Amino acid sequence: MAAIRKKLVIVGDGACGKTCLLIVFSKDQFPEVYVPTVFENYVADIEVDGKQVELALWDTAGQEDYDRLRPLSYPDTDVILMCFSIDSPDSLENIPEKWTPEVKHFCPNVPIILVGNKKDLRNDEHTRRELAKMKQEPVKPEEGRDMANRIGAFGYMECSAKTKDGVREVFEMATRAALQA
Amino acid sequence: AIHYEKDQRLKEIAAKTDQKSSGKLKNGLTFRKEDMLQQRQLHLEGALCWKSTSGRLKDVLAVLLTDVLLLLQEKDQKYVFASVDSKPPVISLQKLIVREVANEEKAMFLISAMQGPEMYEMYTSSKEDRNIWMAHIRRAVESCP
Numbered sequence: 123m124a125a126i127r128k129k130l131v132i133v134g135d136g137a138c139g140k141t142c143l144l145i146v147f148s149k150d151q152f153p154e155v156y157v158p159t160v161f162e163n164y165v166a167d168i169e170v171d172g173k174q175v176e177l178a179l180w181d182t183a184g185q186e187d188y189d190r191l192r193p194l195s196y197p198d199t200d201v202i203l204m205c206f207s208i209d210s211p212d213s214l215e216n217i218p219e220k221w222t223p224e225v226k227h228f229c230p231n232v233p234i235i236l237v238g239n240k241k242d243l244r245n246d247e248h249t250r251r252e253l254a255k256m257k258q259e260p261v262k263p264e265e266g267r268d269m270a271n272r273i274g275a276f277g278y279m280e281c282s283a284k285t286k287d288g289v290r291e292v293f294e295m296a297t298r299a300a301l302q303a
Numbered sequence: 304a305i306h307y308e309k310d311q312r313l314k315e316i317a318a319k320t321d322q323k324s325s326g327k328l329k330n331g332l333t334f335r336k337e338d339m340l341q342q343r344q345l346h347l348e349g350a351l352c353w354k355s356t357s358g359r360l361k362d363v364l365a366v367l368l369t370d371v372l373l374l375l376q377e378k379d380q381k382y383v384f385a386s387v388d389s390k391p392p393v394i395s396l397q398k399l400i401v402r403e404v405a406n407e408e409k410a411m412f413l414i415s416a417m418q419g420p421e422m423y424e425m426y427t428s429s430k431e432d433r434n435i436w437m438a439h440i441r442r443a444v445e446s447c448p
């Protein structure tokens with residue numbers, strides 16, 4: 123029954139949490155079996171600022187082998203969620219190197235929300251210990267915000283689909299961006 | 304009152320297809336009336352609507368064969384290969400996937416994958432008909448040579 127419909131597309135590295143984020147938002151349930159995405163689309167509703175909006179959620183492949191398929195999802199997009207995972211510095215590095223040039227090409231004036239996924243792993247002792255063996259550490263909020271500025275993002279958010287922390291807020295911000303001309 | 308048979312229906316569709324019409328495949332080959340009759344089985348045929356970019360629903364006859372799905376329109380009482388958004392009206396079944404349209408239970412996305420991919424948004428008459436079409440397309444893709 124929403125009288126407003128908008129289109130959202132999610133992109134970012136393989137395994138960075140895109141599908142889980144979309145399914146937690148649209149079904150309120152974390153999908154426990156990981157199946158790499160080729161193409162999917164979902165529907166979800168949101169109320170933000172007293173405004174009821176229906177979102178079409180276009181799920182895309184993070185794998186480079188499906189690069190030629192991804193542009194099928196980009197037409198007539200109202201907002202992009204561009205994701206990385208907080209436990210993977212590499213996925214943040216691919217934001218300016220891969221995702222941003224692609225999105226700016228196919229969706230030049232579409233607002234981008236830069237989203238750090240898997241925030242639950244930032245303070246996970248095991249995660250920190252394993253990353254340190256590799257001379258890595260979880261992405262810091264300041265690093266995410268700096269990257270958002272570097273890519274001209276509409277906004278920056280962090281969330282955990284696993285715990286639901288920040289999920290509603292990611293989609294509130296995305297909806298606000300989707301509603302702008 | 305001879306009972307419907309898929310092989311006879313295919314012959315009938317071919318007979319009603321304009322001899323001058325051809326339909327492009329994504330690889331640049333074309334398909335013609337004669338190809339319908341060349342060692343191909345018909346799995347399913349029926350009316351669909353092909354939703355164009357302009358948002359217009361274009362009536363087509365969809366014809367699911369052994370290795371391709373054909374989208375046909377009507378003209379002067381004959382079939383012609385469909386002309387919608389300059390997209391190939393002959394879809395190879397190899398590497399074709401099908402998906403529900405989340406906000407429209409009557410519709411389905413057909414996504415083909417060499418010379419690039421293509422997406423088609425097709426409307427059936429009902430959710431039940433969508434399921435029948437998706438099931439038949441998936442089975443045809445499975446047994447496609």
Ligand SMILES: Nc1nc2c(ncn2[C@@H]2O[C@H](COP(=O)(O)OP(=O)(O)OP(O)(O)=S)[C@@H](O)[C@H]2O)c(=O)[nH]1
Pocket residue numbers: 134135136137138139140141142143153154156157158159160182183184185239240241242243281282283284285
């Ligand atoms: N710890 C933690 N794990 C998560 C979270 N979200 C997703 N995951 C896990 O990460 C893995 C990949 O998640 P998924 O959402 O499927 O990635 P994707 O970005 O859609 O991957 P692809 O389809 O481009 S290959 C899964 O094992 C999933 O359970 C999260 O918030 N916290």
Ligand SMILES: [Mg+2]
Pocket residue numbers: 140141142157158159181182
């Ligand atoms: Mg996925």
